[PDB]
Design a protein around this nucleic acid. Structure first.
Lengths: 172, 158, 217, 202, 129
RNA sequence: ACCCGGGUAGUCCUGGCUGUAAAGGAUGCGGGCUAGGUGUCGGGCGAGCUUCGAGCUCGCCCGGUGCCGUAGGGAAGCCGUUAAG
RNA sequence: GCCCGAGUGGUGGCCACUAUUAUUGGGCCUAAAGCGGCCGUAGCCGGGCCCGUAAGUCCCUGGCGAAAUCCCACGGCUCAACCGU
């Protein structure tokens, strides 16, 4: 499937973390958080199992899982299957479309950003998108823009004004 | 060390000489030893007691150490000295003494039958024989056609 | 928080009057090294000896209470209730003391326990090495260990970095106070009894050093 | 350590140090010299010379005066009292007044550096607290007394007064030798008699 | 009777250890135990041993350093593939460091770590750590 | 009914059947390993005593039969070289 | 007010929790649970030392256990699910 909920769902320490996270990144539902936890879990689980086994097993398996994390951008230039396990649910959430839109300064604030991509006020590559989850690669970061849009077809959309007053990117 | 069999009682700790080659302050030839053995088997004594009297009189603790090497296939010792001559009983003494005794019991019981305990050792001695039989068959001192019974115990003794 | 650190220790060192020789040498600033109290097995008889080592600032002595129980003894025309409490002193930095205390009133017991716990401090040796490579810090324990307390059987297991403290909450409190980041927890036998389970985890984290290994050599 | 001359060999042997009582146990078997034809065991007299020497050393070492000689014995409390007068520290009680070591609320509270027991069987309490505090422990041990928890020994007789006298005497001599006042090779300034006990009125 | 004479050696050796005697005596003796103590010494766990072969039996007097924690035989003595090693690695041993899961092998006898470096396996014999 | 005075089966012997129990040490059996102490029974050994008999005793050893207790185990009682290690 | 959210809840079934089925990984003095005790058949399990075989056992190669589903990569569909390599 594509979710997880820990053995006991109403536990306070688990719930606190989320609600603080919930405002921080401005999710719409908890499921979204979960998506990234459960995605994080799989990398870890596999990274760990690979390092463990006999070193002669086609190393390709390791390479492959270090390649993707580099490309995605979570991993920068570190060479150990142990740094992978040193990610957290915050790092994944930094990697989202939503986050990366606010960061660059295409949006005033993440709550605003939620509006933009839905109505097709953010282009990526040549395509528009509807899904704010969207996993944004490192190579993919450089290609976020406007062309046939309500934010940028002129220089007197109040939209331009709303983004300018803030001008602050960074972790969401 | 012990085995409390039909008992709870730890077994005797009697132990061998840790001598591996024999005393030379004691002195006998392969020929002299062989005579002593043959003389004693001629009396009516049996190999354990033959080894006993030789120990107590002639001062040889076990024959194997003194004798071998004189044909180093294996150790040369009492009954292996006897078999080469033809003085050996085809039944192993082990199995013989056993059965021997057994036939005596039966006669007691014959006259006296109200005996728990005496009945209960009949059962305890047979079942050692059975075993001692069972393995010999496979080793080969007693043919595979045999099987043990109290009429086939009264025939071997007589 | 910086220098305010010693100031609590020195404020304690204004009126602290040593009972022991241990409490004295510490109050003189000598052997200023908790670790150098442990190795030697010199008796922690004074509470303040520790307050001397743990200031406001760096390690942050995380005082914490687990369970508060109400028990009775029946007496002539009376039930005499009291309270038992379980408290945990520890620094995330690799020391820990587990304490329990019994008293008529509540507040007192908390206090008693807090004190009790100090005496029974322990180093937990963490896994420098890790599991896999000694990349940086001691994330885990070195070796898998087990606890034994009445019915309770806790295994601590080395672990992956980030796979953090995977145990029941009660222990999870104690462990965090130790400074084990990552550890697989295999329990066996009724935990309901908190005091023990805890005593388990504590005993366990205790036995760490008691393990004699090859890298020591 | 050093060879048994006289004073050393005539002193122990003249004093009934040798004569031990009933029971042997497996650990003590090493100091035990010989069997009489009665169950009365004799201790080795050499071993007593030997294990008294190192006991001048071991107690010349802890030079600060919080050495405690306690006794549960009626005989022994007099040699002990006199012994303590010379040295410079002693806990007197018929018992230990438990909470001598473990408790400092007690009005009688000491913090020793060494202990001397007389009978491991009677002074078990003084031992009991000697395991907790972290105190090394030197003593007088009999054919009947174990060495469990008892880390350094002086196998001597302790059941009688002459002996109970000789030892806390020769010892008071030995530690004063090491620390450097009156020697164990000079004849002691104090007479033996005070350490010796006597019953006129009870 | 006895069986698993090895095991009755080992088990002494450990219960020996746990007391903190100085040296051991093992009354029944053998190749299995002999060989195993040999490999054990080779890794270093133990000090020196002498066996005296009495006309009765071999006996091993063994010197105890203090190193050994726990060292035990395997019950049905399972066959273990060189792929399944890792499983049997995680179970019996205390961590990746130690590596004397002593197996018996085509090459001879080895620890776990000496087995892996060659690359060969088989039925388990005993453990040591 | 407990208490008292009579009383059959049975209780005894012989042969047979029946097969149960808190039939307990509530602790299946075998081997190896793991402080000790003490009392006791029988066997061995080195001595002293002697009524010249191992009769009276000391100690080591072997087999059995109790009690106490270190390490450990146990929930605790307890168990602890006669294991419940 | 808390949870979750086009879902959320009720009944039923299965698995987990339940080392409450014990291989991993349970017990059995007094908690359930030792047969009242023995014998030996079938079975399982076996002291040391040398030589043969190499049946188990390990190692290597080779024939082979369809596709799909699973796991990993890259690529495709706005995204993913899904599909292709």
């Amino acid at each position: 499937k594509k979710y997880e909920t820990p053995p006991h769902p109403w536990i306070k320490e688990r719930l606190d973390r989320e609600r603080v996270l919930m405002d921080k990144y401005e999710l719409k539902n908890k499921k979204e958080l979960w998506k990234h936890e459960t995605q994080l879990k799989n990398f870890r689980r596999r990274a760990r199992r690979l390092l463990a086994a006999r070193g002669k097993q086609a190393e390709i398996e390791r390479e492959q899982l270090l390649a993707r994390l580099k490309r995605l951008g979570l991993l920068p230039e570190d060479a150990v299957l142990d740094d992978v396990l040193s990610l957290t649910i915050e790092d994944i959430l930094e990697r989202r479309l939503q986050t990366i839109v606010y960061k660059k300064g295409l949006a005033r604030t993440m709550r605003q950003a939620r509006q933009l991509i839905v109505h097709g006020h953010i282009e990526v590559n040549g395509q528009i998108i509807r899904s704010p989850s969207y996993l944004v690669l490192k190579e993919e970061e450089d290609t976020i823009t406007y062309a046939r849009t309500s934010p940028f077809a002129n220089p007197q959309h109040p939209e331009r004004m709303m983004i300018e007053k803030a001008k602050q990117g960074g972790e969401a | 060390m012990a085995r409390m069999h039909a008992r709870k009682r730890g077994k005797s700790g009697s132990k061998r000489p840790p001598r591996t080659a024999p005393p030379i302050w004691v002195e006998y030839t392969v020929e002299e030893i062989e005579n002593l053995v043959v003389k004693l088997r001629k009396e009516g004594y049996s190999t354990a007691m033959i080894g006993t009297i030789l120990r107590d009189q002639y001062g040889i603790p076990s024959v194997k150490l003194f004798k071998d090497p004189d044909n180093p296939n294996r150790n040369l010792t009492i009954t292996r000295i006897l078999e080469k001559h033809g003085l050996a009983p085809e039944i192993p003494e082990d199995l013989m003494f056993l059965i021997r005794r057994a036939v005596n019991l039966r006669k007691h019981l014959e006259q006296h039958p109200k005996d728990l305990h005496s009945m209960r050792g009949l059962q305890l001695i047979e079942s050692k024989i059975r075993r001692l039989v069972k393995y010999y068959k496979r080793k080969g001192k007693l043919p595979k056609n045999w099987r043990y019974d109290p009429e086939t115990a009264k025939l071997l003794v007589r | 928080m910086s220098q305010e650190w010693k100031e609590y220790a020195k404020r304690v060192l204004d009126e602290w009057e040593p009972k022991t020789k241990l409490g004295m040498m510490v109050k003189e600033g000598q052997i200023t090294d908790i670790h150098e109290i442990f190795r030697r097995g010199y008796q922690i008889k004074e509470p303040e000896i520790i307050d001397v080592l743990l200031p406001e600032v760096n390690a942050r002595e995380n005082q914490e209470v687990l369970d508060i129980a109400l028990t009775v003894r029946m007496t002539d025309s009376g039930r005499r209730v009291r309270f038992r409490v379980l408290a945990a002193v520890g620094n995330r930095d690799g020391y820990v003391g587990l304490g329990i205390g019994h008293g008529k009133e509540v507040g007192i017991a908390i206090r008693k326990a807090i004190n009790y716990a100090k005496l029974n401090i322990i180093e937990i040796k963490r896994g420098c090495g890790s599991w896999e490579c000694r990349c940086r810090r001691p994330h885990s324990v070195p070796f898998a260990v087990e606890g034994k307390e009445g019915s309770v059987r806790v295994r601590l297991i080395p672990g992956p970095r980030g796979l953090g403290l995977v145990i029941g909450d009660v222990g999870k409190k104690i462990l965090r106070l130790a400074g084990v980041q990552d550890v697989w927890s295999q329990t066996f036998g009724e935990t309901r009894t908190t005091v023990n389970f805890a005593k388990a985890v504590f005993n366990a984290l205790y036995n760490t050093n008691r393990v004699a290994i090859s890298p020591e050599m | 350590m050093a060879d048994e001359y006289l004073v050393p060999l005539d002193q122990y042997l003249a004093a009934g140090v040798h004569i031990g009582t009933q029971q042997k146990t497996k650990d003590m078997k090493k100091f035990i010299y010989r069997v009489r034809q009665d169950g009365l065991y004799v201790l080795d007299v050499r071993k007593t010379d030997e294990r008294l020497k190192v006991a001048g050393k071991f107690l010349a070492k802890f030079e600060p005066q919080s050495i405690l000689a306690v006794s549960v014995r009626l005989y022994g409390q007099k040699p002990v009292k006199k012994f303590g007068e010379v040295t410079g520290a002693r806990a007197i009680p018929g018992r230990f007044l438990p909470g001598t070591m473990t408790n400092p609320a007690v009005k009688n509270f000491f913090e020793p550096d060494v202990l001397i027991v007389t009978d491991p069987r009677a002074d078990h309490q003084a031992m009991r607290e000697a395991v907790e505090i972290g105190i090394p422990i030197v003593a007088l041990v009999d054919t009947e007394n174990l060495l469990s928890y008892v880390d350094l020994a002086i196998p001597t007789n302790n059941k009688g007064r002459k002996a109970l006298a000789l030892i806390y005497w020769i010892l008071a001599r030995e530690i004063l030798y090491n620390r450097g006042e009156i020697q164990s090779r000079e004849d002691f300034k104090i007479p033996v008699e005070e350490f010796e006990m006597k019953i006129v009125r009870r | 009777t006895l069986l698993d004479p090895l095991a009755n050696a080992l088990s002494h050796i450990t219960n020996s250890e746990r007391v903190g005697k100085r040296e051991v005596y093992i009354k029944p003796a053998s190749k299995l135990i002999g060989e195993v103590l040999r490999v054990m010494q080779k890794y270093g766990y133990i000090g020196e041993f002498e066996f005296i072969d009495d006309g009765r039996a071999g006996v091993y007097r063994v010197q105890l350093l203090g190193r050994i924690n726990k060292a035990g035989a395997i019950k049905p003595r399972f066959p273990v593939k060189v792929s399944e090693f890792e499983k049997w690695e995680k179970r019996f041993l205390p961590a990746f460091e130690f590596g004397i899961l002593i197996v018996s092998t085509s090459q001879g006898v080895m620890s776990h770590k000496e087995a892996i470096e060659k690359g060969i396996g088989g039925r388990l014999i005993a453990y040591v750590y």
